Design a protein around this nucleic acid. Structure first.
Ligand SMILES: [Mg+2]
Ligand SMILES: [Mg+2]
Ligand SMILES: [Mg+2]
Ligand SMILES: [Mg+2]
Ligand SMILES: [Mg+2]
Ligand code: NA
Ligand code: NA
Ligand code: NA
Lengths: 131, 49, 99, 192, 143, 178, 221
RNA sequence: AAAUGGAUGACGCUUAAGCCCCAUGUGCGUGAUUGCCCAUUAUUCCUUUGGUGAGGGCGGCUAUAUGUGAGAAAGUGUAGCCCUCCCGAUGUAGACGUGGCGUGGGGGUGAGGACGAAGCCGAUGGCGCGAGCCUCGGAUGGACCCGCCUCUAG
RNA sequence: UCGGUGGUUGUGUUCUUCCUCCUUCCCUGUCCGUGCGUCUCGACGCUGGCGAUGGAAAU
């Protein structure tokens, strides 16, 4: 299956918005927190400080949620879930759940190859061989 | 833009042709020579009157 | 006075000293030559094996003159030239040629 | 319209020559139309000047409009002198602004002029059906000056391409604001 | 008027004409001089072949943006150059079919140069090499 | 071409009306950079002399006057400038120039350097081309005599902008750098 | 400088003998101090190697009394709590030029420190610089295009003496020795200079008749 | 005329790099009307987000198997039903909105697990403006746990 | 533009503009034509370098 590849995919920003001064304290997480301080230099938008997220960074609605391969990810848990992705072959790729065991993964991978449904965490060799 | 100007003003081709004729070498030489004569004759005659 | 902007570079060429002379070089190709520390891939790596070396080049183009003394403005394709090139040699080629 | 412009210029030249040949002077008609441009920002404007600029539709820097020069309007221009620069337009300045920066106000929307049909649709009058009609109704005054100019969005122009002398201080002092007579055409040629 | 679809259509500078001497600015033959022979049927590259005896540049293709067309020209009415066609370059030691084409065209080019009144000076001119010395300005020249 | 302050002649009058039909027509000679400044000076003079304001008057002419030729002449300019702590100061000065506009432009620059007076504090009363034998300044009368000669010394000779070297060889024009 | 055994051994294997980088030698006689320093500092930042000689002949506008007083005011400044940390007051003319150039560079970045490393600033013309090549001058700071004739000026060497410099006699003794040796050598080889001049002449009438005409057209013969 | 050594910002500058004025590309008493540098400003192009928003399509008959192809919902709000166009976007105290994110438990519905659940580790990458979600590896662990709609709170 | 042709504006005690109506030369560029079987998204020419299943190239 070959997806509809976008001509160009543009990300406005690649770096993540990290918390202020999270590198100086081991207990502080790097997830973003909005600073609320009267004298805060990040809040007041000084020139050499970190940036805060806002609506201008939003991704182009045309290429949003599209992975570099050109597919969209849909979680898959069993063989029956593979039949929802059969018709929309070129738009969606299945993602096998983390907790699905190795015994059940054999049936899913075997069935997906027959149906020509792309999986992102299958076996690489089976994807390489063409029929 | 040439086709936008013509679309807004259908008379532009005739307006540009008049400017091209004014730019012509022979016609502008006669026009300048004739203008000098006309001004000279009127000035001389008005002073005499 | 507020700081630098690294997406454009300023290049001073020998024997120009004039804006009218700098206008002759608009559109010309420019390269910066340096060396790395091992042999990486290059153009004609397989057709001309003698070319393989530590030498590397970063290309760019001349956009417009700068000031009145013959300085030009240069954009280096997509990226920017490294700051270790400040004060070093830049090659200004004669192509593409309008003459 | 082209014939009318050429006839008017020839008549004015003949009268001026007739006066000069006989040792007298010919007085010209007072100007009827002006072009007003805002040359200052939106910070620290007193309430009276702020209200006048809103009534002139000049809410942004380098916005330009056409006005009629009657006594009620001239008294408004004098009150906001240090905020505007204005003068008397020429035929080429009017043509350039309409053909290059002209946007109509249709249904509350700012629509760029691309053909005569939308001009005829916006102005239901039969005297305004083409771009030359808009130019004439502004340059030579005309009974529909208010209808034509209010149906146009205020013109948005770029800064002067060669710079300006001094945004403070009057033009007579060597600055920029105030009345410039016909010298406003050189100022606008670098902005349009 | 010439249609863009027609083969005779071409958009090249008026300086680059058949018979014009040119200075090669890039490639293995940089700095040498050659004679422009013709242009390829479409809006393609020019075909330059300086006399192999003089400059040692064989028949090949070149983009007009990588030469400088000088003001000195040699008449090419006697020469034909009708055997130069795009497929001879499309084929991609020297084949002897290429050798005979190169030799035959060279003799006609040499004879045409000799027919020019300043033939001896031109032959020496085509032997010369262009270079940028320390302290010269190519933008002030006239070519 | 070089001088600023062109020569303008402004003609104007008060607008016709009842209680004063057929008003007097006045003439004014002014030296200004452009005709907008010329008309501003005309109405300032009219306001302070004839009690006529620009709102109730009109301008009939703003012509530019023409000078004679390109010879060397003597010009007498009587000028007045205002300053605080001194009031109005009136003086007469002599200059060498080619045209009246050039002489007056020289006078304006001269008053700036020697008395620190700006353009709008200066009023020009008149300018006249006087002959020799009646100029009273020696800095002007020293150029009158025939067979006048002098050499050029302490010259600073700068090259044309295209040559303009930076480092040059000590005993040659070799232009090592630039 | 001072090649160790690692350097000499590598040159021996490779076959290299000598190398000389591209260097400009500037004769600083009769040059305005401030104008020459500003021109040289910009050229250093542009990637140039510069050696300046005769630093004792630099000139300063004003009288010697005025300039001597200016230096004595600079000498008065020192860190009161520990003068060995305070500003250092160099006294030789060549050290004064380097300090002046240093104040026209960004001296607290690696870029400026590298630029200052490319200037040498000798006094007089030392023996290792005499035979390198022709010297150059800066016409924008030559003091006969800069100063009015009637204005008094200071010579840097005279001012550097009387405030602490104690090598004026050594420099003038070596300079006089250099002039005699250079003058004697230049008078020699006058025969070969004349012989070459007499060779370019009479080369004409031996060349072909067409090349002489081309030389005449371009004003070379 | 004052109390640490020291400030036109420093160096320095005197045919100024000082004071008062005048000009400008290629060619300054023969090209009349832009010498050049720097913004979160102006014009213009692309993308996002919100509207006192403005228009348009939505009754699926043109023809077509595999070894030119996919969608189309009468709609506040989502991975927005789709396509054009116009106008705004910073903000302390404060107000309001969000088919906005996350945690323990109840009612429903659908799955996962000894071929390895929860927990823990990471130069594991991908997605989202973000709160976060998901895959990967463990030379970790050894028995439980989650997606979606709703209800509830120590 | 030229030569004539009668109405017009304005000085001065006739001439000065502008018109309409012919006569000479001189310049430039005229007319016609192509809606879709409801809507949307998708389709990236020529020349060379690199890539032939590898501890490979490219992003
Ligand atoms: Mg991201
Ligand atoms: Mg605060
Ligand atoms: Mg300014
Ligand atoms: Mg907000
Ligand atoms: Mg609980
Ligand atoms: Na941390
Ligand atoms: Na103010
Ligand atoms: Na300062």
């Amino acid at each position: 299956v070959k997806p509809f590849v976008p001509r160009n995919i543009v990300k406005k920003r690649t770096k993540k918005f990290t918390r202020h001064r999270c590198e100086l304290f081991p207990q502080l997480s790097s997830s973003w927190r909005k600073p609320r301080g009267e004298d805060s230099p990040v809040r007041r938008r000084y020139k050499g400080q970190k940036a805060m997220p806002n609506k201008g960074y939003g991704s182009d609605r045309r290429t949003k949620y599209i992975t570099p391969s050109g597919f969209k990810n849909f979680p898959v848990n069993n063989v029956q879930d593979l039949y929802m992705l059969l018709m929309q072959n070129r738009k969606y790729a299945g993602v096998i759940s983390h907790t699905v065991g190795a015994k059940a993964r054999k049936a899913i991978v075997r069935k997906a190859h027959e149906l020509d449904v792309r999986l992102i965490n299958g076996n690489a060799k089976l994807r390489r061989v063409d029929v | 833009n040439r086709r936008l100007r013509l679309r807004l003003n259908p008379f532009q081709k005739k307006e540009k042709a008049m400017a091209k004729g004014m730019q012509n070498k022979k016609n502008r030489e006669a026009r300048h020579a004739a203008k000098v004569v006309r001004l000279a004759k009127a000035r001389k005659n008005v002073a005499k009157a | 006075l507020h700081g630098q902007n690294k997406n454009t570079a300023l290049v001073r060429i020998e024997n120009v000293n004039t804006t009218e002379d700098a206008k002759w070089y608009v559109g010309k190709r420019v390269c910066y030559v340096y060396h790395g520390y091992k042999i990486k891939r290059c153009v004609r790596w397989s057709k001309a094996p003698a070319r393989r070396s530590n030498t590397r080049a970063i290309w760019g183009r001349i956009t417009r003159p700068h000031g009145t003394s013959g300085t030009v403005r240069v954009k280096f394709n997509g990226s920017s030239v490294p700051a270790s090139a400040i004060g070093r040699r830049i090659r200004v080629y004669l192509y593409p040629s309008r003459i | 319209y082209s014939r009318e412009y050429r006839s008017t210029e020839k008549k004015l030249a003949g009268l001026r020559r007739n006066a000069r040949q006989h040792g007298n002077y010919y007085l010209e008609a007072k100007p009827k139309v002006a072009v007003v441009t805002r040359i200052r920002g939106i910070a620290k404007v007193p309430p009276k000047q702020r209200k006048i600029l809103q009534l002139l539709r000049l809410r942004q820097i380098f916005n330009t409009v056409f006005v009629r020069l009657n006594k009620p309007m001239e008294n408004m221009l004098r009150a906001v002198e240090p905020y505007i620069a204005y003068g008397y337009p020429s035929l080429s300045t009017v043509r350039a602004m309409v053909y290059k920066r002209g946007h109509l106000k249709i249904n509350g929307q700012r629509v760029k002029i691309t053909d005569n049909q939308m001009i005829k649709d916006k102005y239901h009058n039969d005297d305004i059906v083409c771009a030359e009609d808009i130019v004439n109704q502004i340059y030579a005054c005309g009974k529909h000056f208010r209808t034509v100019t209010n149906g146009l969005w205020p013109f948005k122009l770029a800064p002067p391409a060669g710079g300006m002398r001094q945004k403070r201080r009057h033009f007579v002092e060597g600055g920029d604001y105030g009345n410039r007579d016909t010298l406003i055409n050189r100022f606008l040629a670098r902005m349009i | 008027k010439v249609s863009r679809k027609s083969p005779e259509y071409s958009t090249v500078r008026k300086s680059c004409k058949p018979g014009t001497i040119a200075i090669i600015l890039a490639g293995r033959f940089r700095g040498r001089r050659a004679v422009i022979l013709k242009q390829l049927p479409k809006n393609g590259p020019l075909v330059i072949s300086g006399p192999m005896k003089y400059s040692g540049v064989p028949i090949r293709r070149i983009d007009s943006r990588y030469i400088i067309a000088t003001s000195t020209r040699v008449d090419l009415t006697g020469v034909d150059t009708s055997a130069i066609t795009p497929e001879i370059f499309k084929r991609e030691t020297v084949s002897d079919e290429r050798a005979q084409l190169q030799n035959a065209i060279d003799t006609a080019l040499i004879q045409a140069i000799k027919k020019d009144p300043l033939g001896k000076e031109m032959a020496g001119y085509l032997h010369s090499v262009f270079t940028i010395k320390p302290g010269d300005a190519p933008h002030r020249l006239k070519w | 071409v070089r001088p600023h302050l062109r020569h303008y002649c402004v003609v104007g009058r008060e607008t016709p009306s009842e209680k004063n039909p057929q008003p007097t027509v006045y003439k004014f000679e002014v030296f200004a950079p452009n005709f907008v400044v010329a008309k501003s000076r005309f109405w300032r003079m009219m306001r302070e002399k004839n009690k006529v304001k620009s709102t109730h008057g009109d301008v009939l002419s703003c012509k530019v006057v023409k000078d004679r030729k390109l010879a060397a002449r003597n010009y007498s300019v009587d000028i007045a400038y205002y300053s605080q702590r001194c009031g109005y100061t009136h003086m007469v000065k002599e200059f060498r120039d080619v045209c009246k506009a050039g002489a007056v432009s020289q006078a304006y620059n001269d008053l700036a350097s020697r008395h620190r007076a700006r353009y709008h504090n200066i009023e020009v009363l008149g300018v006249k081309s006087i002959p020799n034998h009646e100029v009273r300044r020696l800095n002007v009368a020293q150029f009158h005599p025939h067979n006048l000669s002098f050499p050029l010394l302490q010259r600073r000779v700068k090259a044309p902008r295209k040559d303009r070297v930076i480092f040059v060889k000590k005993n040659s024009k070799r232009a090592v750098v630039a | 400088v001072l090649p160790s055994r690692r350097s000499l051994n590598r040159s021996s294997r490779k076959g290299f003998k000598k190398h000389r980088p591209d260097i400009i030698v500037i004769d600083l006689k009769d040059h305005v101090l401030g104008r020459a320093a500003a021109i040289v500092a910009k050229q250093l930042l542009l990637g140039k190697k510069i050696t300046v000689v005769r630093c004792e002949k630099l000139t300063i506008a004003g009288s010697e009394i005025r300039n001597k007083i200016k230096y004595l005011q600079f000498l008065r400044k020192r860190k009161l709590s520990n003068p060995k940390l305070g500003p250092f007051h160099h006294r030789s003319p060549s050290d004064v030029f380097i300090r002046t150039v240093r104040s026209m560079l960004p001296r607290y970045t690696k870029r400026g420190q590298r630029a200052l490393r490319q200037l040498v600033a000798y006094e007089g013309v030392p023996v290792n610089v005499v035979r390198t090549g022709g010297r150059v001058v800066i016409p924008k700071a030559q003091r006969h295009n800069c100063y009015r004739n009637e204005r008094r000026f200071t010579v840097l060497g005279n001012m550097c003496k009387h405030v602490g410099w104690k090598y004026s006699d050594v420099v003038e003794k070596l300079e006089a020795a250099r002039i005699e040796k250079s003058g004697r050598h230049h008078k020699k080889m006058e025969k070969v200079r004349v012989a070459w001049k007499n060779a370019r002449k009479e080369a004409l009438k031996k060349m072909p008749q067409k090349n002489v005409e081309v030389l005449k057209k371009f004003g070379l013969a």
